[PDB]
Amino acid sequence: LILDFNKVQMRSQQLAPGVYAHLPADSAELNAKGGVAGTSGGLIVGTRGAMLIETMLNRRLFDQVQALAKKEALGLPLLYAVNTSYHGDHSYGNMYLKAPTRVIQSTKTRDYVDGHLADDKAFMVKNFGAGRGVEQITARTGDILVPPGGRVSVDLGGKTVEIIDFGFAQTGGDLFVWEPQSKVMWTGNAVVASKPALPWLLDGKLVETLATLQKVYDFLPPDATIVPGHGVPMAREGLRWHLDYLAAVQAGVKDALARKLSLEQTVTELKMPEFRGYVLFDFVHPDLNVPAAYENLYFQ
Amino acid sequence: LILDFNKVQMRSQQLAPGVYAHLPADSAELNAKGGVAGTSGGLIVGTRGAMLIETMLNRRLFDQVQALAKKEALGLPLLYAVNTSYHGDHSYGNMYLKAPTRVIQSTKTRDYVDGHLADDKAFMVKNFGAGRGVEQITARTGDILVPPGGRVSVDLGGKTVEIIDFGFAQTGGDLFVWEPQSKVMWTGNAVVASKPALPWLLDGKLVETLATLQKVYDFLPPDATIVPGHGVPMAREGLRWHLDYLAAVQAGVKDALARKLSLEQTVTELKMPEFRGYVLFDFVHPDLNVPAAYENLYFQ
Ligand SMILES: [Zn+2]
Ligand SMILES: [Zn+2]
Ligand SMILES: [Zn+2]
Numbered sequence: 099l100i101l102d103f104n105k106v107q108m109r110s111q112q113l114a115p116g117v118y119a120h121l122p123a124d125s126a127e128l129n130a131k132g133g134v135a136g137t138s139g140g141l142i143v144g145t146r147g148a149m150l151i152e153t154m155l156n157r158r159l160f161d162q163v164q165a166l167a168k169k170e171a172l173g174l175p176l177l178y179a180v181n182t183s184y185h186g187d188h189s190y191g192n193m194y195l196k197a198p199t200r201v202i203q204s205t206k207t208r209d210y211v212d213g214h215l216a217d218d219k220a221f222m223v224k225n226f227g228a229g230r231g232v233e234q235i236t237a238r239t240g241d242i243l244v245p246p247g248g249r250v251s252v253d254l255g256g257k258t259v260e261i262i263d264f265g266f267a268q269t270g271g272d273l274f275v276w277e278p279q280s281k282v283m284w285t286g287n288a289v290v291a292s293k294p295a296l297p298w299l300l301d302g303k304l305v306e307t308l309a310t311l312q313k314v315y316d317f318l319p320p321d322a323t324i325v326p327g328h329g330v331p332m333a334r335e336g337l338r339w340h341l342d343y344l345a346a347v348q349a350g351v352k353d354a355l356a357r358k359l360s361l362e363q364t365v366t367e368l369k370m371p372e373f374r375g376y377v378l379f380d381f382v383h384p385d386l387n388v389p390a391a392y393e394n395l396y397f398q
Numbered sequence: 399l400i401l402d403f404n405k406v407q408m409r410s411q412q413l414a415p416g417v418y419a420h421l422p423a424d425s426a427e428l429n430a431k432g433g434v435a436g437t438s439g440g441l442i443v444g445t446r447g448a449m450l451i452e453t454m455l456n457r458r459l460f461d462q463v464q465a466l467a468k469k470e471a472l473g474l475p476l477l478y479a480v481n482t483s484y485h486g487d488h489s490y491g492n493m494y495l496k497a498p499t500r501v502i503q504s505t506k507t508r509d510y511v512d513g514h515l516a517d518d519k520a521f522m523v524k525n526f527g528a529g530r531g532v533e534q535i536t537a538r539t540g541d542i543l544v545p546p547g548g549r550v551s552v553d554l555g556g557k558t559v560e561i562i563d564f565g566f567a568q569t570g571g572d573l574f575v576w577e578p579q580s581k582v583m584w585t586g587n588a589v590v591a592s593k594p595a596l597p598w599l600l601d602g603k604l605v606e607t608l609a610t611l612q613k614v615y616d617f618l619p620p621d622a623t624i625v626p627g628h629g630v631p632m633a634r635e636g637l638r639w640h641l642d643y644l645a646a647v648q649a650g651v652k653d654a655l656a657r658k659l660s661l662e663q664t665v666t667e668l669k670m671p672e673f674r675g676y677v678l679f680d681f682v683h684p685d686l687n688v689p690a691a692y693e694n695l696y697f698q
Contacts, residue, residue, distance in 0.1 A: 390523075
């Protein structure tokens with residue numbers, strides 16, 4: 099296993115008054131070395147209650163972030179929990195929430211969980227192992243659903259949180275969480291981690307993903323804090339690595355398609371050694387991102 | 399990638415008059431090293447025409463076994479093609495069959511493909527790479543469907559093939575193909591390969607899988623030849639490796655449960671070094687099979 103979710107230990111990092119990141123203890127070390135880190139989350143606390151960002155893969159990690167949240171919110175109720183995407187490491191813990199907490203997710207997330215949780219769980223067991231808590235998961239879909247391209251505001255008392263679908267960034271029901279007074283943005287999987295981590299273009303939706311992340315970059319103020327899906331907080335300029343990588347792949351694949359190169363020749367040509375460093379580079383880049391983008395842009 | 403389906407090259411190996419195995423060229427080498435081999439298939443020919451076993455992952459591999467079948471069947475028509483399970487490496491090639499070929503598969507396979515082929519493809523791209531022909535696959539379900547626990551016979555002229563659902567061994571729609579004259583049985587994934595390859599208990603259904611393989615063992619004559627899903631032919635006694643492994647896991651887990659051991663100490667205790675050899679042992683045994691069996695037997 100590249101990442102053993104039974105070995106992740108969640109810690110609290112205060113970002114501002116009432117605003118916290120939930121981070122694996124080894125996440126800073128792994129991101130610096132280009133490793134693969136566990137899921138990041140967070141907590142925003144207002145005057146009357148709190149909002150949890152991500153509910154984690156399993157009961158163990160859910161219990162850890164719930165314990166952190168009790169200290170962070172000092173007894174105020176958990177009013178909301180947000181899933182940035184359907185991916186189980188961000189959403190499987192929904193089942194362990196109690197009243198009065200309401201789940202916020204995209205309508206696409208709800209549709210997918212409703213129809214396919216069983217095969218999603220099978221996939222997660224295959225890649226992250228059995229006995230990591232996935233088998234126990236039952237479906238708990240959202241209460242408040244953000245439609246495609248939509249946004250909603252949530253008032254926690256004195257703090258109003260923005261939950262925004264900027265467009266396709268990984269799944270098609272990707273939500274960003276924006277806390278405008280501390281200027282903290284949670285991206286979920288849409289931003290994996292700081293450099294040298296790479297985006298995963300699972301469906302080859304390169305053009306959409308680049309446009310979405312450009313909109314996020316243009317939206318954020320220069321002093322914003324970004325909490326990536328699998329990394330520790332970073333500054334707004336940390337996004338440029340991802341924007342440059344996607345723009346380089348887009349320019350290379352478009353040029354390949356204009357010259358009518360085969361897929362194999364395109365993969366051979368777009369080695370892009372200047373973007374290496376990620377421990378998974380030699381899989382994500384030539385065995386997923388480049389061929390998937392080629393196949394997708396073939397039809398555009 | 400543990401196995402690159404773009405590098406597999408299928409070969410013909412005759413087992414009897416009109417009975418051929420379709421085996422990757424390196425399957426014998428890989429089985430002897432405890433490696434991970436590509437999908438095995440086969441062909442049975444009577445006076446009326448031929449039956450193809452497994453339609454393979456992609457167009458390249460489908461075309462290879464179709465070319466072999468044209469020589470093996472000496473111009474006779476391809477009357478049938480059988481999918482032993484829904485797994486794409488056994489069935490994705492269905493879409494490329496032409497008239498008059500009829501597909502035989504389980505009703506469970508048809509139901510899974512109808513509801514979840516898109517998810518299945520996404521899983522196969524993640525774990526076997528993009529650009530390996532999975533993206534091109536469209537659904538083509540069976541003409542003749544075997545109900546759960548059912549069986550059907552097919553007369554090819556001078557040869558009658560038995561297609562049998564012996565019970566749950568991998569997916570719940572697992573079909574075995576039995577040719578009583580040559581005494582050849584195809585198992586699909588229900589038997590991965592000869593020793594040291596291990597069963598994959600993806601659902602933890604240990605008792606059911608052991609019972610199914612025991613029934614197959616009791617069914618076969620002592621001079622039967624088995625074509626496993628991912629290996630070269632085995633003798634009937636080669637099943638005892640898999641039967642003994644599953645019985646050992648069941649005894650170990652049952653005794654751990656009765657002593658009130660946690661999942662983590664059951665994994666630590668069930669090292670079972672006498673069943674080593676598989677290059678995937680350190681994953682499939684402690685990270686899939688032992689935990690999944692523990693969780694499946696937990697409430698009996
Ligand atoms: Zn994630
Ligand atoms: Zn599905
Ligand atoms: Zn297989």
